[PDB]
Design a protein around this motif. Structure first.
Motif, PDB file in Angstrom:
ATOM      1  N   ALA A   1     -32.055 -34.416  -9.447  1.00 34.56           N
ATOM      2  CA  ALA A   1     -33.014 -33.476  -8.872  1.00 34.56           C
ATOM      3  C   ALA A   1     -32.424 -32.690  -7.695  1.00 34.56           C
ATOM      4  N   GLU A   2     -31.762 -33.398  -6.780  1.00 38.58           N
ATOM      5  CA  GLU A   2     -31.008 -32.797  -5.670  1.00 38.58           C
ATOM      6  C   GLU A   2     -29.933 -31.814  -6.142  1.00 38.58           C
ATOM      7  N   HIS A   3     -29.141 -32.228  -7.131  1.00 36.24           N
ATOM      8  CA  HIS A   3     -28.045 -31.398  -7.624  1.00 36.24           C
ATOM      9  C   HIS A   3     -28.521 -30.166  -8.398  1.00 36.24           C
ATOM     10  N   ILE A   4     -29.610 -30.319  -9.151  1.00 31.82           N
ATOM     11  CA  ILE A   4     -30.250 -29.199  -9.858  1.00 31.82           C
ATOM     12  C   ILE A   4     -30.680 -28.119  -8.860  1.00 31.82           C
ATOM     13  N   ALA A   5     -31.294 -28.559  -7.765  1.00 30.61           N
ATOM     14  CA  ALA A   5     -31.696 -27.678  -6.666  1.00 30.61           C
ATOM     15  C   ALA A   5     -30.509 -26.924  -6.055  1.00 30.61           C
ATOM     16  N   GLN A   6     -29.347 -27.575  -5.999  1.00 34.06           N
ATOM     17  CA  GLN A   6     -28.122 -26.963  -5.462  1.00 34.06           C
ATOM     18  C   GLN A   6     -27.387 -26.072  -6.473  1.00 34.06           C
ATOM     19  N   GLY A   7     -27.973 -25.873  -7.651  1.00 34.88           N
ATOM     20  CA  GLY A   7     -27.359 -25.028  -8.673  1.00 34.88           C
ATOM     21  C   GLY A   7     -26.344 -25.710  -9.578  1.00 34.88           C
ATOM     22  N   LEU A   8     -26.285 -27.040  -9.533  1.00 38.47           N
ATOM     23  CA  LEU A   8     -25.412 -27.792 -10.440  1.00 38.47           C
ATOM     24  C   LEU A   8     -25.987 -27.770 -11.851  1.00 38.47           C
ATOM     25  N   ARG A   9     -25.100 -27.659 -12.834  1.00 37.77           N
ATOM     26  CA  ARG A   9     -25.480 -27.605 -14.242  1.00 37.77           C
ATOM     27  C   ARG A   9     -24.607 -28.535 -15.078  1.00 37.77           C
ATOM     28  N   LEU A  10     -25.144 -28.973 -16.214  1.00 39.52           N
ATOM     29  CA  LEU A  10     -24.397 -29.788 -17.164  1.00 39.52           C
ATOM     30  C   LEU A  10     -23.151 -29.035 -17.633  1.00 39.52           C
TER      31      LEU A  10
ATOM     32  N   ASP B   1     -42.229 -33.067 -23.136  1.00 38.24           N
ATOM     33  CA  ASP B   1     -41.213 -34.124 -23.121  1.00 38.24           C
ATOM     34  C   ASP B   1     -40.168 -33.947 -24.225  1.00 38.24           C
ATOM     35  N   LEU B   2     -39.651 -32.728 -24.340  1.00 40.00           N
ATOM     36  CA  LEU B   2     -38.612 -32.444 -25.319  1.00 40.00           C
ATOM     37  C   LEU B   2     -37.283 -33.082 -24.910  1.00 40.00           C
TER      38      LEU B   2
ATOM     39  N   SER C   1     -35.861 -31.694 -16.771  1.00 43.57           N
ATOM     40  CA  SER C   1     -36.825 -30.838 -16.056  1.00 43.57           C
ATOM     41  C   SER C   1     -36.184 -29.751 -15.193  1.00 43.57           C
ATOM     42  N   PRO C   2     -36.750 -28.525 -15.228  1.00 43.77           N
ATOM     43  CA  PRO C   2     -36.281 -27.439 -14.370  1.00 43.77           C
ATOM     44  C   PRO C   2     -36.686 -27.645 -12.908  1.00 43.77           C
ATOM     45  N   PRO C   3     -36.023 -26.937 -11.981  1.00 41.77           N
ATOM     46  CA  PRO C   3     -36.347 -27.087 -10.558  1.00 41.77           C
ATOM     47  C   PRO C   3     -37.829 -26.855 -10.221  1.00 41.77           C
TER      48      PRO C   3
ATOM     49  N   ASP D   1     -40.165 -25.929 -21.166  1.00 41.13           N
ATOM     50  CA  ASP D   1     -39.764 -26.386 -22.496  1.00 41.13           C
ATOM     51  C   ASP D   1     -38.410 -25.785 -22.893  1.00 41.13           C
ATOM     52  N   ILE D   2     -38.167 -24.535 -22.487  1.00 45.09           N
ATOM     53  CA  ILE D   2     -36.871 -23.868 -22.702  1.00 45.09           C
ATOM     54  C   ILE D   2     -35.737 -24.635 -22.014  1.00 45.09           C
ATOM     55  N   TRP D   3     -35.948 -24.982 -20.742  1.00 43.91           N
ATOM     56  CA  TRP D   3     -34.992 -25.787 -19.980  1.00 43.91           C
ATOM     57  C   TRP D   3     -34.657 -27.096 -20.693  1.00 43.91           C
TER      58      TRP D   3
END
Ligand code: LHL
Ligand code: LHL
Length: 241
Positions: free
Chosen positions: A189-198, A119-120, A146-148, A161-163
């Motif tokens: 979660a949906e957008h992360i799956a689609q390759g969206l990033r901050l 929980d970083l 959280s990563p995909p 933890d890296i993510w």
């Protein structure tokens, strides 16, 4: 017994509440500033059991326990939660990279001990009187951190933890914005799956952004280690200052 870890509760003084188990600021024999957590009973002390074996300058340090009486005693972090600090206290960008390094050093130590935080985030970091950031709540759903592979099938690893660390860098450089501020957890979660990033925070240089972005590779195996991230941060620190 817990040997050297056992603290006489009668050596403690209680000065102010920090949060509400219940956490108070106090002193030990009027000598050390301390934080004191008060309380299931058995799982409460498991936190301290974890902390007994982990010790680092950028990790909240356990001081002892009171179990015959139940307290967990640690070092005191005067400036409170990092998330509040970023939103309320005041930064030049070099101070921000320092905060990132502080956390990276803690996580590199945890990595070297094959220990997973899980929980970083800025909420789970504390800040001392000198502005030093330390990782906390490591002895204890964070969708936005959280990563995909975690979101889809609970694949926890060094790389999850890296993510989260990349997201924490983003929190720091955005001065405590909630990641994916206009999305719900479900949408994130949906957008992360689609390759969206901050996006790159305005305060982050392209080099700093490259570091945080590297934490978000779709393939876990392609993400760096904390040892690599630490070397990258130091290089940028030398180049930008
Ligand atoms: C490892 C395992 C356990 C500990 N526990 C520990 N207990 C008390 C103090 C302390 N560490 N440190 C590092 C201080 O600087 N203290 C300290 C402080 Cl914070 C102020 C003034 C005097 C002292 Cl001895 C008090 C530390 C490292
Ligand atoms: C709105 C909040 N407001 C307060 C009125 C502003 C100030 O808030 C503050 C001020 C200072 C701190 N400083 C602080 N230092 C050490 C620990 C700690 N807080 N907490 C919350 C723990 O659970 N600890 C801990 C851990 Cl992590 C594990 C085991 C035992 C403990 Cl005591 C150790 C934290 C919050």
């Amino acid at each position: 017994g817990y040997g050297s870890w056992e603290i006489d509760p009668k050596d403690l003084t209680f000065l102010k509440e920090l949060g509400t188990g219940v956490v108070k600021y106090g002193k030990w024999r009027g000598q050390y500033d301390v934080a004191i957590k008060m309380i299931s009973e058995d799982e409460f002390i498991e936190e301290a059991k974890v902390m007994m074996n982990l010790s680092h300058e950028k990790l909240v340090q356990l001081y002892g326990v009171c179990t015959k009486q139940i307290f967990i005693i640690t070092e005191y972090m005067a400036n409170g939660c990092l998330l509040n600090y970023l939103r309320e206290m005041r930064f030049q960008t070099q101070q921000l990279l320092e905060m990132c390094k502080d956390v990276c050093e803690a996580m590199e130590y945890l990595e070297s001990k094959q220990f997973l935080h899980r929980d970083l985030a800025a909420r789970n970091c504390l800040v001392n009187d000198q502005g030093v950031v330390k990782v906390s709540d490591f002895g204890l759903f964070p969708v936005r951190w959280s990563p995909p592979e975690v979101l889809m099938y609970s694949k926890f690893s060094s790389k999850s933890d890296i993510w989260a660390f990349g997201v924490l860098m983003w929190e720091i450089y955005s001065l405590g914005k909630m990641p994916y501020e206009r999305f719900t957890n479900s949408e994130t979660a949906e957008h992360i799956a689609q390759g969206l990033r901050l996006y790159r925070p305005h305060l982050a240089s392209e080099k700093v952004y490259t570091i945080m972005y590297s934490c978000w590779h779709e393939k876990a195996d392609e993400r760096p280690t904390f040892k690599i991230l630490l070397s990258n941060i130091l290089d940028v620190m030398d180049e930008e200052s």
